[PDB]
Amino acid sequence: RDNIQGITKPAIRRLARRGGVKRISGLIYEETRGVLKVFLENVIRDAVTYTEHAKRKTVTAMDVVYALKRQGRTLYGFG
Amino acid sequence: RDNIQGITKPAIRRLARRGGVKRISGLIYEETRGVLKVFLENVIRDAVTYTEHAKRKTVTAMDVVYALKRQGRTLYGFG
Amino acid sequence: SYSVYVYKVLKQVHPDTGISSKAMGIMNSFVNDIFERIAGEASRLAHYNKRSTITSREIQTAVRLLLPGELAKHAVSEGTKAVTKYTS
Amino acid sequence: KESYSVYVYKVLKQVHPDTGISSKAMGIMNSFVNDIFERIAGEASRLAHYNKRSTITSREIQTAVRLLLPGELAKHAVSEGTKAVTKYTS
Amino acid sequence: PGTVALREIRRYQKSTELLIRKLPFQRLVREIAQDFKTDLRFQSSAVMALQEASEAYLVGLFEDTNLCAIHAKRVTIMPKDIQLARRIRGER
Amino acid sequence: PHRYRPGTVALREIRRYQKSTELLIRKLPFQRLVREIAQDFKTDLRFQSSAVMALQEASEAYLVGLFEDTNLCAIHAKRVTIMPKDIQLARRIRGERA
Amino acid sequence: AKSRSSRAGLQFPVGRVHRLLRKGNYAERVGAGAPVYMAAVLEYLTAEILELAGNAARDNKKTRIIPRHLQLAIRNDEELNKLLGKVTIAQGGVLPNIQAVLLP
Amino acid sequence: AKSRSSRAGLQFPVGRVHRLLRKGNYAERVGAGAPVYMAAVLEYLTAEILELAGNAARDNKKTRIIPRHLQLAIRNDEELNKLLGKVTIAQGGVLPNIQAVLLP
Amino acid sequence: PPRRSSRLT
Amino acid sequence: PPRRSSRLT
DNA sequence: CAGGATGTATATATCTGACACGTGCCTGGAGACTAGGGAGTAATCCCCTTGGCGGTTAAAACGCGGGGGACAGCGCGTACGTGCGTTTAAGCGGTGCTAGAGCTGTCTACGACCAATTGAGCGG
DNA sequence: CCGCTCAATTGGTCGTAGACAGCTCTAGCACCGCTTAAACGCACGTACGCGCTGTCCCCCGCGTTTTAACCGCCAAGGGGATTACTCCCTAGTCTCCAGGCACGTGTCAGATATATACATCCTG
């Protein structure tokens, strides 16, 4: 329940700094929280679909890697 | 031989009007010509690669469709 | 080509509307594209699970992976309604 | 199970004799090799199916390499593949 | 200045024809292909598919160019708008 | 006392976080969020620690690239502050939400 | 004797889909309900896009479906637009849309 | 006696790549030059990325290669960046880059 | 009884 | 002589 | 500019675990045949691609004239960055339990493969 | 709408892929407590966003003039499909047996530390 506020404003500002951002408007944090929620929902839906297809109960890192590769976001270093 | 000029300024204007563009700067036409040249080169290179793999000399609509399919632009209608 | 069956389906959904010869090539491309999309993801799912059979389970999972939102919910409901009628 | 760690390390020791590699960078190189293998193999499979051929040969792999790798990377990979095939078939 | 352009937008947005002349586009396609293989024949359908793809790509790019224009508080699209759209797409 | 101008620590932070390769989101709140989102797709779900780590490693790169596009959208408007509209223009152009 | 496609209640060919799955190099074996499921999914999607295209043709006072109607139907529906989002339809045109700041 | 990798001058395996090609279900048959070609191409790409990553490590003054060095080698090379353009490297960070208008 | 969807009706 | 690359130099 | 303080690189010493190597061993690759079709090649036919011509007229090109708009400069006010003091869970390190993933061992039914028999969908 | 032949369905065997039960231990969850790094709340000030105003120039709209696109037709032949031998290349199978994978082992690259000198950015 409301765990998206655990992605604190300093963390979002750190991610913006890594992206080269100098000044950040005050409404950026909520927009970033919504965007991250949508992205995570889309990836986790496919990860759980892969989990249930194997009749498993734990989501493997390979489930996440497959859920990412099918969105054109292939990730190295996790198998 | 200078056949990129055949993509006339009125034609670029019509293509922009279909995109909803109201005003066009005077340097947009040459930039559009360069963009079209790059896109066409990238597609016709894969189309020709598909053509010479079949030991053919005629570029086929299927070659173009396949060359488009591999760049993420799927074409409906030509097979 | 799926021209005959696309026309059969169109006569079921719109009995008094016709189709062009360029709008039927488009539907053939659509069918041949979506078939490749589902059958390439059912193929991927079988290899992930180290299985050699593409069953209706892989087709259902691939449909749920590729079709958006409410398209998947009804495509699955029609797929399990046809497998039921086919085996009974 | 299986991985390309031994071969990646051999290429590293032959390209950079005194440089080592961490366990995380090896996982990344195994993912890289698997990714590129699957890409080239899938493109070759499509080429074989496009031309109604039931065999993947050296020419399909070469055409897949030309389609996938960009620019001079494709040219040098094609040259290396050709060199290896003519050294093997000799 | 601007009404004949709104009318033009409405005219070309409800139309489905090809907006580039077919002969100059065909010559452009042949000239580009001349750099990959000499003595290259083309199906008519090959060039037609190429033109449909190119016009769709350019209309789609202009649709993003216009958004980049409105973002900078302008109604005129400039080459910097095309460059921004192409960067964000990933083509640059 | 000794105060820096309101653009200096920002650039120093940009240099610091563009040089490191760590994870910028705290792992426990992110794990909680990942568990909560998955709770709507399956109950009594379990996660490998490596699965949540892969999810974080993907989400953080996604957000960093999004902010890289957002900064370009803000500079295009002759601005240095990134606003929600820059995020929206970036996402609209890369197709995420048109 | 029931052609195996009317045995499931579909207008799409179960036998042809089975042949294509067996010849497409998808797996080493193909199940029994896999062609029935795939043909049911293809037929429903076809009937849905064709449902919207005929409606669009009716709105334009036409009794035929042209690429324009298919494009209009796909892009005016959110889920078929999401599915066919990287798809170019020949002779399809664009959805009529001009922004507010451009309109006077 | 001899290995088919040593017969081709390769360090990557061609027997393993042959078995992966046969088992991967890409075609009904696999030639006797496809594994050699694929292993040569994979070895060339591995040698390129490693040769650039070992240079990225050496500029940093490290005798090891970490994911950061691989990212520095990939994103700083025009062709490997286009090849690995949809790839996320875990613990790889980003290329240090600040837009010129932001600097004072 | 023309064929119709329930996703659309 | 190591396995230097000819694409870069 | 001087310079005073903040941020930070340098020299020089201890952990410290992780990587590079050693070792047994087992299984996957290699070798040596056989069988048989997949692909190559030669011949052939005819489609459809290219090339040229003549005429029209639609569209492109060009020049001109306004005015709408892009851009520059200026002013204001407000919202974001910086810093400091306080609070709060993130994290680290155990400690414990058990759910379930991975792995045999067994058996069965399901799909591939071959043989009649048709009978519908393609061409005209 | 008519002719007919290629593809679809049906019957029956068999071998193996996959379902099911039993087990074993790994790893994922749950909890507790201490530390302290990090988040959070607040105040201040300034720099940036945003609005307004003015200039002038670049883009659009319009009326001639030109240019070549488009259309129809005639013609040749290059090369795409197609078919029928022939053989060479690949799958399949049964020995070996070496290469690569799964555990010990230590020693060095890397991370972490203070005293020191050098270089920052922001003022009076």
Numbering used by the authors:
A (entry chain F), B (entry chain B): 23 to 101
C (entry chain H): 36 to 123
D (entry chain D): 34 to 123
E (entry chain A): 43 to 134
F (entry chain E): 38 to 135
G (entry chain G), H (entry chain C): 14 to 117
I (entry chain K), J (entry chain L): 361 to 369
From the article:
pmcThe specific interaction of proteins with the nucleosome is central to the regulation of chromatin function and dynamics. Here we used cryo-EM to show that both proteins bind to the nucleosome acidic patch via analogous arginine anchors with one molecule bound to each face of the nucleosome. In addition, to study nucleosome structure in the context of active chromatin, we analyzed nucleosomes that were reconstituted with a promoter-containing DNA sequence from a Xenopus borealis somatic 5S rDNA gene.
To this end, we reconstituted the Dsup–nucleosome complex with recombinant Ramazzottius varieornatus Dsup and the nucleosome core particle containing the 601 nucleosome-positioning sequence and performed cryo-EM analysis. Importantly, the two structures contain extranucleosomal densities that correspond to two Dsup molecules bound to either side of the disk. Furthermore, Dsup R367 interacts with H2A E61, D90, and E92 (with the exception of Dsup molecule A in structure II, in which E92 is pointing out) and thus functions as the arginine anchor that is found in most acidic patch-binding proteins (Barbera et al. 2006; McGinty and Tan 2021).
